[PDB]
Amino acid sequence: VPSNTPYSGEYGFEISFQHQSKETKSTTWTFSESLKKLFVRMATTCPVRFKTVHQPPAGSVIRAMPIYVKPEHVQEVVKRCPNHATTKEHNEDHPAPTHLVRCEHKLASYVEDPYTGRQSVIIPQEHPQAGAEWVTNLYQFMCFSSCVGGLNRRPIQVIFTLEHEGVVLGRQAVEVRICACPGRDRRAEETAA
Ligand SMILES: [Zn+2]
């Protein structure tokens, strides 16, 4: 049972999403702060920002792992539907075509726990650039939330953990809905709530 409990930890690990102004905003993603929920199109690069208030130990990493939100689904591993996992589109030379969550980082490593089957992607933790508070990493989500035989309309979260040599040092999480029209789904979900 992977924990989703937010945890800044001793190093002050935090995530965020950059401001979107109407003039240059991407239509491929949008983040509802009131819902703590990312809306994003399938197979589009989505910017996620990370920081630590204090420098963590050398060689620390950041893991991204999707999990289902509701008790009725928590124990089931989140991964792509067989349809998308076995097609050739999106998958030419990918090392882990069944993983839902991908990261563009050059050193991204795709791992699967041999016992639980949990899939995640790990990248190095990095010092921000000069004068910058945040490091931006690019993720993609490789099925729609409605993929029959995959997510099948069940809600998911993505867990971000800062880790060093296996030990979780910090944790943040957001809900994620992968949909054709992030702005439309955000407005409608924010309206219903
Ligand atoms: Zn799919």
Residue numbers in the entry: 4 to 196
Give the text the authors published on this PDB structure.
Structural differences were found mainly on the surface and in loop regions, for example in the L1 loop, which plays a unique role in DNA recognition by human p53. In A. pompejana, there is much less divergence in this loop, apart from a one-residue insertion at its N-terminal base. However, the overall conformation differs significantly from that seen in human p53, adopting a much more recessed orientation, with a high degree of disorder observed in most chains of the asymmetric unit.
To gain further insights into the evolutionary history of p53 and factors that govern the stability of p53 family proteins, we have characterized the DBD of a p53 homolog from the extremophilic annelid Alvinella pompejana, which lives in tubes at the edge of hydrothermal vents at the bottom of the Pacific. We show that it has a p53/p63-like DBD that is more thermostable than all vertebrate p53 DBDs tested so far, but, intriguingly, not as stable as human p63. In addition, the A. pompejana homolog shares DNA-binding properties with human p53 family DBDs, despite its evolutionary distance, consistent with a potential role in maintaining genome integrity.
